[PDB]
């Protein structure tokens, strides 16, 4: 009959809200969904779950207490930027302890299939023990995963010396040039511990039923097909997930949480405000914040700056509080010190462009809101996402960042105010080339909205997947009938 699914999200904020939204999409289309999580993580999205159950979807959370770990204080259950760095491996250790409780819950709930974050590679074995399909949720774009596979297969970085020599990523449908410094540490040379984790994750994916991406075909459908052939797997684009289940203002306001900025926006003319955000994980050093502050002030344009994680005192916070005073004196700038209501802001007509670290969720949300991008990749797969934005679909301009760094370090590179200002001036300056870029993102904005409406590309992929899973459930029911009839004869 009715499919039953258990969803297992990860415990970093961006991954959590992406996989929770995928859970909400499945429940919107008839699946009886249970989301397993811990209290501090549930706090970020239980409100969204309550709104959904009122549209009488069958979706609920199942709260599991976070384990005791020596030296880990109570209440620390998330991997985000506000988390003190020495607690991260302990938090990850506590998550690992939960695996057996998760598996017991699978055996107790007996779902027809499970949908789990990529950071749970063992879940493919759990599903095989239960005899059910496991879907894996992958972060980021098909493009970025195609680029990673090109690096792994062809090693173009091995044939160059220096750090400024560009190389093509072979086999991709588009010509894409990068330097060795723009590759992740775990891909560049000898394996590190993350290289081995990624190997285990990709092996798990190859054994899984299929993968789910927050993507849509009009944006990067060529890479969706490329990726399926690179992996030899099934995959479905089911995005933009943020738009699909957060079309209401109340949902946009509460997403991932736990009005003054909206009144400020209401006072501005259309497309006049630059939105600046570097995602849920980034922490900039003071010297970088100084360059951004000067670039924003010197641009002459209105802006909202989501400052992200700031070191206290002379590590940045003192400077930003002084800068915030300055820019309120002119009514040109607005700083957001905590979690911003990103979906509500991007949809506001006053917003005209976005400075982004190329986190895939912000790229997708900006496309839906029809906003051109200034690209400032930092870590993870963001340098690959920049290539797609800048070189393939041409909806952004780069600030000019040269070097990948890990998420927990400041690196050696400081992007200077002049280079930031060049990107702002292009986006906000009204020149003809920027206007052609705005038209390109507008076309894609219309495509996003169509993709999740009835018989859009993402709607259809989800419908086809659910039909396959219904088919598998029914096959097992009819096989039991066949076995019982055979035992009757004898
Ligand atoms: C933010 C995302 C989710 C990710 O972001 C995702 O990055 C993917 C990528 O890396 O390609 C993209 O595919 C995807 O789209 C994007 O969402 C970027 C990488 C990372 C920041 C990641 C990390 O750095 C290192 C560790 C260590 C691993 C390990 C083995 C150790 O080494 O000690 C054990 C201890 C330890 C602290 C566990 C925690 C992780 C897994 C940690 C902090 C979790 C958050 C994670
Ligand atoms: O102040 C903030 C920062 C981030 N986000 C949301 O958090 C996600 C950030 O994910 P992204 O892929 O852009 O970057 P990451 O956080 O993974 O580095 C997006 O859904 C944003 O809408 C938000 O609502 N408010």
Automatic annotation (TrEMBL):
The entry sums up its family as follows: Belongs to the UDP-glycosyltransferase family.
Gene that produces this protein:
UGT73P12
Entry protein name? Glycosyltransferase
Superkingdom: Eukaryota
Pfam families documented for this protein? Glyco_transf_N (PF26168), UDPGT (PF00201)
* Entry-linked PANTHER family: GLYCOSYLTRANSFERASE (PTHR48047), SCOPOLETIN GLUCOSYLTRANSFERASE-LIKE (PTHR48047:SF45)
Q: Which UniProt keywords apply?
A: Glycosyltransferase, Nucleotide-binding, Transferase
**SUPFAM superfamilies (UniProt xref):** UDP-Glycosyltransferase/glycogen phosphorylase
| PROSITE patterns according to UniProt | UDPGT
**Binding sites annotated in the UniProt record for UDP:** 14, 255, 280, 339-340, 361-362, 365
Q: Which InterPro entries match?
A: Glyco_transf_N, UDP_glucos_trans, UDP_glycos_trans_CS
Which GO terms fall under molecular function for this chain's record? nucleotide binding; UDP-glucosyltransferase activity
Q: Which residues form the Glycosyltransferase N-terminal domain?
A: 6-241
Species classification: Eukaryota, Viridiplantae, Streptophyta, Embryophyta, Tracheophyta
Which residues are listed as membrane-spanning?
Answer: none
């Amino acid at each position: 009959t009715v499919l039953k699914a258990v969803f297992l999200p990860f415990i970093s904020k961006s991954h959590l809200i992406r996989v929770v939204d995928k859970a909400r999409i499945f429940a919107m289309h008839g699946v009886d969904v249970t989301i397993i999580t811990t209290p501090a993580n549930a706090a970020a999205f239980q409100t969204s779950i309550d709104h959904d159950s009122s549209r009488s979807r069958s979706i609920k959370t199942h709260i599991v207490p976070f384990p005791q770990v020596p030296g880990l204080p109570q209440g620390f259950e998330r991997l985000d930027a506000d988390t003190p760095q020495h607690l991260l491996p302990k938090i990850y250790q506590g998550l690992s302890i939960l695996q057996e409780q998760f598996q017991q819950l699978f055996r107790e709930m007996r779902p027809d299939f499970i949908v789990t974050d990529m950071y749970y590679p063992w879940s493919v074995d759990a599903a095989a023990e239960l005899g059910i399909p496991r879907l894996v949720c992958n972060g980021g774009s098909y493009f970025a995963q195609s680029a990673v596979n090109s690096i792994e297969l062809f090693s173009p970085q091995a044939k160059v010396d220096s750090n400024t020599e560009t190389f093509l990523l072979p086999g991709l449908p588009h010509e894409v040039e990068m330097t060795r410094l723009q590759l992740p540490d775990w891909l560049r040379g000898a394996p590190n511990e993350y290289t081995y984790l990624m190997k285990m994750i990709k092996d798990s994916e190859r054994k899984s039923y299929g993968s789910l991406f927050n993507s849509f075909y009009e944006l990067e459908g060529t890479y969706e097909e490329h990726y399926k052939k690179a992996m030899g797997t099934k995959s479905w684009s089911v995005g933009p997930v943020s738009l699909w289940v957060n079309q209401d203002a109340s949902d946009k306001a509460c997403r991932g949480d736990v009005g003054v900025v909206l009144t400020w926006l209401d006072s501005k003319t259309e497309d006049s405000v630059l939105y600046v955000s570097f995602g849920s994980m980034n922490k900039f050093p003071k010297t970088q914040l100084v360059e951004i502050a000067h670039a924003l002030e010197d641009s002459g344009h209105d802006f909202i700056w989501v400052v992200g994680k700031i070191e206290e005192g002379e590590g940045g916070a003192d400077f930003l509080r002084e800068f915030e005073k300055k820019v309120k004196e002119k009514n040109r700038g607005y700083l957001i010190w905590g979690w911003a209501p990103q979906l509500l802001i991007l949809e506001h007509p006053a917003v005209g462009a976005v400075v982004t670290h190329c986190g895939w969720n912000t790229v997708m949300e900006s496309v839906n809101a029809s906003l051109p991008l200034a690209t400032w990749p930092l870590f993870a797969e963001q340098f690959f996402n920049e290539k797609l934005v800048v070189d393939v679909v041409k909806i952004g301009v780069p600030v000019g960042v040269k070097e990948w760094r890990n998420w927990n370090e400041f690196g050696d590179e400081v992007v200077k105010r002049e280079d930031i200002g060049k990107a702002i001036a292009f986006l906000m300056g009204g020149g003809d080339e920027s206007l052609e870029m705005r038209k390109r993102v507008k076309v894609l904005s219309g495509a996003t909205k169509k993709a999740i409406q009835v018989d859009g590309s993402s709607y259809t992929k989800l419908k086809e997947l659910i039909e396959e899973l219904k088919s598998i459930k029914l096959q097992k029911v009819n096989n039991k009938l066949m076995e019982a009839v055979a035992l009757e004869h004898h």
